[PDB]
């Protein structure tokens, strides 16, 4: 009742439950479905699970170990630009700031009416993931190897540049289910081209 | 003085018949003879505790954070029975001292009383521990029939006014004293280099009042006076032009 | 947004942490008060000065036509001797609302350049140029004194009246409709108790008229 | 700690006989005459070669001059060094850096 | 730890109990050994003492009422500091925000698992009250006319002596009562300076 988790049905709930999928209340007024909030929830099968991990998709522990990482610092730095504002933040950190929201309309929101959306297989969504972890892996590079002496990307720099490539990244998620091995070349003909423009 | 005193040693039965027993006394030589008496009901806190042990006793369940339903009734059986009558010319006054637990105002002790009385008296803490002997804080303190008990014909002329101006003149020693600590001690303004050196005579000369000093109300805005010679005439903006004119050149 | 456990201890520290919060406010409200209040009188004094170098510029320069019209051209002369300076800045710190501000102080020192320079055919259309030049100067690093004091403050208020407003718009009522939860939820268990109190009450009666 | 006039012709010789210049053969002079026929980019490398310089307190520049360079000192909001705008004998100080307010 | 007036077996307590010294957790997280807050304790034995204190020990309540003084002036000014910042606000409150530190740390600070500080007697008690308030009597006059800044390194020999008066043996009897005396003239030559 009311949207409080502090209740005795839920209090009761969660001390018997391995998984909790705790939904927000501001998350669908914002039309953000599915409105799980990706800070409260959580999991207790993963210990369990990376052993299937380690046999059929042998990549994505560490790949949800950054994803959590990049959603958990967007969270301290939400409450640093609502009070002091965005001017004075750091380069490191507006990359961690735009690639989570990268993340909250590309990874979480998923339209579930539409051909697309209505039903993801698992290697769409480790396509996608693997994606757009190694964008920010490779913007970290970005910042840090040439970070005082050259003048360097500001990353407004990419921003006005690499916008056909995150255009391929903000709608890699029509894939429709008519193709199966096509997804999977253009989830690597997609990091192709995220590939060359750090050269260029 | 008729005192008569209940101690924590004493039974819990007893504390609730000490203020029946307090005023039928104190409107007896009210209200059959003709004195003027002042009721002081100290530990008024302690009187709902011990209000709270026998209404539990019936067995009866609690009301508002522990204090029976009827509080709001046996308060005001004792509080109620003051004012003076059109008959006789005694009187009866009220000071019930209370202290409400952890400076919450809100606790029904000091709430249902502030239903019942006509005005706080303000104790703080703050003025204590700076070691000013009586902790009267002027500010959030009121008297509701201030109004009507001073004047001419009652105390004095001034009186009236010299107490309007001697709460101002510290509402704006207050913030000045915060000023202070913000910008510096000389480049503030003008205006404040002298409100500043009020307040630290408002808080030692007047109302740190010694341990046995008696003080009459002549004797008190003498004081109220000496203070108001600093502010020199045309800044006292309360104060009207004929009772002005009248005191402070001495 | 609620922030803690309700129910007991907690609207005492929320009480606490609002009562702080709120004449925090306040206290730092007089000091973007005070600032803009000496940012507001700086501003007349750059305005009633920087007109007034107008002048002192129209009078210095109208002693150059006084100048060289009689002695020479002073344009290549001047500008193939200098080595050293004779007027040099001294950074001093001023003080407002504890927020340090810099302050330019004039600095003469050290020797002549143009002392022989004219000599034979003026010499006293200049050195007047220069007293008219040196004293234009004098006004000019008082001025630059109070253009370094100008922007400086306008980045201290900015930066003080944000946490003025993130004070009254973001924290307070943050810790003011928590503060209202605590007082519902300590409600929503003193009525919890009034019904286990009040079972008891009547199940004391039924057993007693049980036992009558 | 000096410092620095951009000006003009009029301009320069007569702060220079103020006693504020200073050459200095390993950097720079600190000072710049502008004639009829200097181009706007010589008066903006000059701008940004006296804003590197740590020693300059004071860029004294006329508005007439400014006015064409305005662009770049509108870019400049730092505290140190202050620029300064100085009337000509032609159009002097109108509308220049009060309008931040 | 919890409910500091709010709480029955507390509430009670208070209205019986005439002295109350408060354990605060907040100097028990920097580790302040006593952890006993000086704003919300009391003691109502106050007019019952002074009948004594007049008889043997009579510098101590002249101290005392200065010595609450000075723990409540830094209080607020500690609530200053903390938001404006230190731009230090005065020179005539600075002293008392030091001589304060002084006593919150020396004065107030006790270890009792040491040889000398698991007991200290009153004349050790009202010595170290002595001495630490002759400092702010004297630093008070001096900038009625210099500044701490000066003083603070100037005078750094007599804070050590200060500091440095808490590690006394409590037998010396006689020693520390010189010790007192000692450390008292040595400030009354920088103060005629």
């Known amino acids: 009742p009311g949207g409080d988790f502090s209740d005795p049905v839920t209090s009761a709930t969660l001390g018997i439950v391995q998984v909790f999928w705790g939904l927000d209340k501001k998350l669908a007024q914002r039309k953000h479905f599915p409105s799980v909030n990706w800070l409260i929830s959580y999991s207790k099968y993963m210990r369990a699970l990376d052993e299937y991990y380690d046999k059929h998709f042998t990549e ?29 933040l750091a380069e490191t950190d507006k990359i961690t700031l735009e690639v989570a929201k990268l993340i909250k309309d590309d990874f979480l929101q998923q339209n579930g009416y539409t051909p697309y959306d209505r039903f993801c297989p698992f290697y769409k969504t480790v396509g996608m993931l693997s994606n757009m972890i190694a964008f920010y892996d490779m913007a970290r590079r970005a910042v840090e190897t040439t970070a005082q002496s050259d003048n360097k ?5 990419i921003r006005e540049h690499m916008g056909e490539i995150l255009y391929k990244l903000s709608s890699m998620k029509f894939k429709d289910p008519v193709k199966d091995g096509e997804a999977k070349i253009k989830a690597d003909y997609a990091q192709l081209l995220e ?5 260029f | 003085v008729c005192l008569f005193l209940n101690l924590a040693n004493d039974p819990t039965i007893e504390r609730i018949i000490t203020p029946r027993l307090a005023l039928t006394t104190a409107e007896f030589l009210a209200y059959q003879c ?50 003076r009558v059109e008959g006789r010319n005694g009187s ?21 009383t502030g239903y019942i009385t006509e005005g706080q008296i303000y104790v703080d803490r703050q003025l204590h521990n700076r070691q000013i002997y009586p902790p009267i804080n002027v500010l959030p303190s009121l008297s509701r029939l201030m109004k009507s008990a001073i004047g001419e014909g009652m105390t004095r002329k001034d009186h009236a006014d010299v107490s309007n101006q001697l709460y101002a003149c510290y509402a704006i020693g207050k913030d000045v004293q915060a000023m202070k600590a913000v910008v510096g001690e000389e480049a503030l303004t003008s205006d404040d280099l002298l409100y500043l050196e009020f307040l630290q005579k408002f808080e030692r000369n007047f109302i740190a009042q010694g341990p046995y000093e008696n003080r009459t109300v002549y004797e008190t805005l003498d004081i109220g006076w000496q203070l108001l010679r600093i502010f020199p005439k045309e800044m006292l903006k309360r104060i009207p032009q004929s009772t002005l004119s009248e005191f402070y050149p001495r | 947004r609620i922030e803690i456990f309700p129910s007991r201890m907690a609207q005492t520290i929320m009480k606490a942490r609002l009562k702080g919060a709120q004449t925090g406010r306040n206290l730092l409200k007089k000091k973007s008060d005070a600032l803009t209040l000496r940012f507001r009188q700086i501003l007349k004094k750059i305005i009633e000065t920087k007109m007034l170098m107008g002048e002192v510029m129209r009078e210095a320069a109208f002693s150059l036509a006084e100048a060289k019209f009689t002695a020479g051209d002073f344009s290549t002369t001047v500008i193939q001797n200098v080595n050293k300076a004779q007027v040099k800045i001294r950074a001093k710190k001023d003080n407002v609302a504890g927020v340090t501000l810099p302050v330019f102080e004039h600095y003469h020192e ?25 004293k234009a100067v004098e006004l000019l690093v008082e001025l630059a004194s109070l253009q370094t004091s100008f922007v400086t403050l306008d980045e201290a208020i900015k930066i003080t009246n944000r946490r003025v407003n993130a004070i009254e718009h973001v924290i307070i009522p943050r810790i003011e409709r928590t503060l209202a939860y605590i007082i519902t939820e300590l409600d929503e268990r003193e009525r919890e108790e009034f019904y286990r109190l009040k079972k008891i009450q009547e199940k004391k009666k039924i057993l007693k008229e049980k036992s009558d | 700690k000096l410092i620095a006039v951009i000006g003009d012709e009029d301009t320069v010789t007569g702060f220079l006989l ?55 000192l509108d870019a400049h909001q730092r505290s140190i060094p202050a620029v300064l705008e100085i009337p000509s004998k032609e159009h002097p100080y109108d509308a220049a850096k009060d309008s931040i307010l």
């Open chain 1, 60 to 88: 994505f522990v560490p790949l949800r170990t950054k994803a959590k990482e990049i959603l958990q610092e967007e969270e301290d730095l939400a409450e640093i630009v609502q009070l002091v504002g965005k001017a004075s």
């Open chain 1, 153 to 157: 990307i500001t990353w407004s720099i």
């Open chain 1, 195 to 199: 590939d060359m423009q750090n050269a």
């Open chain 2, 34 to 83: 003709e004195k003027h008496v002042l009721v002081i009901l100290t530990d008024m806190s302690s009187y709902a505790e011990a209000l709270r042990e026998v209404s539990a006793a019936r067995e009866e369940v609690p009301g508002r954070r522990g204090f029976p339903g009827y509080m709001y009734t046996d308060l005001a059986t004792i509080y109620e029975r003051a004012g």
């Open chain 2, 92 to 112: 009866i006054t009220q000071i019930p001292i209370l202290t409400m637990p952890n400076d919450d105002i809100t606790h029904p002790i000091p709430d249902l």
């Open chain 3, 110 to 134: 050290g020797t002549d350049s143009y002392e022989l320079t004219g000599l034979a055919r003026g010499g006293e259309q200049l050195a007047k140029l220069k007293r008219n030049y040196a």
């Open chain 4, 18 to 72: 103020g006693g504020i210049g200073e050459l200095n053969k390993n950097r720079h002079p600190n000072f710049l005459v502008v004639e009829k026929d200097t181009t706007i980019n010589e008066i903006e490398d000059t701008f940004r070669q006296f804003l590197n310089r740590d020693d300059i307190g004071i860029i004294l520049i006329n508005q007439y001059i400014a006015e064409m360079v305005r662009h770049a």
